[PDB]
Ligand binder design. Sequence first.
Ligand SMILES: CCCCN(Cc1ccc(C(=O)NO)cc1)C(=O)Nc1ccccc1
Ligand SMILES: CCCCN(Cc1ccc(C(=O)NO)cc1)C(=O)Nc1ccccc1
Ligand SMILES: [Cl-]
Ligand SMILES: [K+]
Ligand SMILES: [K+]
Ligand SMILES: [K+]
Ligand SMILES: [K+]
Ligand SMILES: [Zn+2]
Ligand SMILES: [Zn+2]
Length: 722
Amino acid sequence: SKATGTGLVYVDAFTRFHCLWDASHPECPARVSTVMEMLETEGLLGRCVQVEARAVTEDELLLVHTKEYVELMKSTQNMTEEELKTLAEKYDSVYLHPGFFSSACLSVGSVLQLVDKVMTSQLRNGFSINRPPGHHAQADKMNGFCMFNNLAIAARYAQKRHRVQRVLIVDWDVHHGQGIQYIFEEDPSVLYFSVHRYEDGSFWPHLKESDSSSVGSGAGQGYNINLPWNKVGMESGDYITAFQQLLLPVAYEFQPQLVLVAAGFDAVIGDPKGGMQVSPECFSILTHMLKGVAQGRLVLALEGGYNLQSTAEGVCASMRSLLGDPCPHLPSSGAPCESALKSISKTISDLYPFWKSLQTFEPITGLVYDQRMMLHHNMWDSHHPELPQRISRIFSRHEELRLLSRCHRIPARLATEEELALCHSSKHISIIKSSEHMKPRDLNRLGDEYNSIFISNESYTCALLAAGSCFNSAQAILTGQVRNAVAIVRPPGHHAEKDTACGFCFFNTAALTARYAQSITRESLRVLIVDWDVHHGNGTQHIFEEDDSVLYISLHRYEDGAFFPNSEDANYDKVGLGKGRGYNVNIPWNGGKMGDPEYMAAFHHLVMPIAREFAPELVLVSAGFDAARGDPLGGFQVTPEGYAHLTHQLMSLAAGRVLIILEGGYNLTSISESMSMCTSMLLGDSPPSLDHLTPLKTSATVSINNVLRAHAPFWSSLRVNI
Ligand SMILES: CCCCN(Cc1ccc(C(=O)NO)cc1)C(=O)Nc1ccccc1
Ligand SMILES: CCCCN(Cc1ccc(C(=O)NO)cc1)C(=O)Nc1ccccc1
Ligand SMILES: [Cl-]
Ligand SMILES: [K+]
Ligand SMILES: [K+]
Ligand SMILES: [K+]
Ligand SMILES: [K+]
Ligand SMILES: [Zn+2]
Ligand SMILES: [Zn+2]
């Protein structure tokens, strides 16, 4: 959706209650004022839209809590310290203050205010900097510093006031939000996900129902997901793997209309309560991942987090993601630990019968375009699909959708022969160069020496412009002129080999760009090449086959070698050679038409876990749009919204340094709409609606499992297969 702005709720009332009988109490006013001070210091506060708090009404509290409980809580405001202590002692880990009720009402109300702004598209997203927390509060009792269940009320409120059918509650606070679990235990309309320290019940709240076996009951069976950690010192790699392999597949199947986050920061490094080692930066990635599930409709509310600085950094990292700032560099490993893999696998097995998605297992944007690249043409067949108008139609669509004016225009330039020699033989360079002065008879003769190649006197210059345009784009990204970019270029490149032209490709644009990126930074710069063109990029695979500095990932229609380029080199068992073993990932599709379900599943279980463990410094996309719905050559059904979601996933890698390079794509409308959607994502627009992602075709399930088996010894994040 086209909503903009990040809401922030903060009122002085959030500091007007504290523990009267213990000055060392961790749940203190400084928690929220430290967060507010850092947001201001980091320049984040001034970038947010200030949203006023409001007091929750009795009717809204009654959506979750009993009348008797609400009346008892109301009466605490007139109590003495002695009366407050006597009542607090009746609950587990709770204090009371005469200002507690008033602040708790404004704490619930602040979330309802953000829910209103987000559900009416006044804002895209928001964060409530509230205290007291809420996720432990139950229908009739206080618990773990909570009086009212903020998010449980907000979810039921969203359903009643804004006609939301499905709400997803994600709880990344180090403790299990048993309050939320109990309230929605039998409710299929509210999916509750909690990741928490458990240690076989030895960690507070010491509940057997905090285990992965508690999947909900009655109509709500399968709608309660617990991810218990049974070892301390969990890191960002563990949280990110859990979101990739478990939460995202389920969330996409659930299709919520709203995402609510119980945003606790007690899992962050330095928290005295948590015992975990999660970097604050991890929360930027987690927040980014949640933007894709409800078309950006995302509300975060502060839960726990007791190290003042750690909590403030966690809030700042999440806020940066909500505002659309590029994802940060992750300071730790992209690989999960064995204990985390064990917990993720157990949760997957416990929720497996309820979710088809789990049943698979056995910033500035640059734009480059030059109309001169239209000069390359087929003089013998004017209807040949690799049309000059492919690039002009894509460019026109960017102008119609007003994307062009939002981009920084990067000039096209010719690649030099020295730059072509980064990937190609001097013999191949000279043969293509010679075509510039050839008569039509000689151009026909030369084209026939290759597999699927047409040449004109303008072909060599167009191929130099396609390569040079991508080098200028990679240079703009790596020198900080832009964060990411799109290259509307032709002829394509991924079929071109070191010593030969092939399948409409003269020079390997993506391969040359990866080597060029390395020549302007360092030889070992980690480059990820994601090739989503419907055909296997045979040339790219071969160029980097023995290389561990360039990870090549291709998704392609294979059909047991019956589809172009018709070689067994495209099969899943081709994992690379020598030090490059594990750095060549082929995802071959067999048995007809694939679409968004299969592509999203391949990204959740293969592309994203491998890419995150590789930790690229630059992401290149060999973006052919010939797997698109309507393509005359591909026969596939990837929709423009499908491509937008794939682009969105890749943006959390390489601190957002993503270059989208045009490859194939032959339906002019399909490629114009698909590539425009990718640019829209790079620009930071909310991911669009994307329904019906299950069931997958049976043969796609076979393909994904074949890949997992081939790459599991190389990549730990794949060992989620028990
Ligand atoms: C012996 C119990 C171990 C865990 N807890 C309880 C607890 C409950 C909730 C949260 C929380 O993060 N709530 O949002 C943190 C700790 C505590 O240690 N709580 C505590 C209570 C009073 C003073 C200092 C600490
Ligand atoms: C017997 C060959 C079968 C595959 N090919 C060739 C081909 C090569 C490369 C690509 C491609 O997407 N290159 O970027 C697509 C098709 C074709 O079908 N090519 C074709 C040529 C003219 C008109 C219509 C289609
Ligand atoms: Cl020819
Ligand atoms: K939790
Ligand atoms: K539920
Ligand atoms: K491909
Ligand atoms: K490689
Ligand atoms: Zn907590
Ligand atoms: Zn192709």
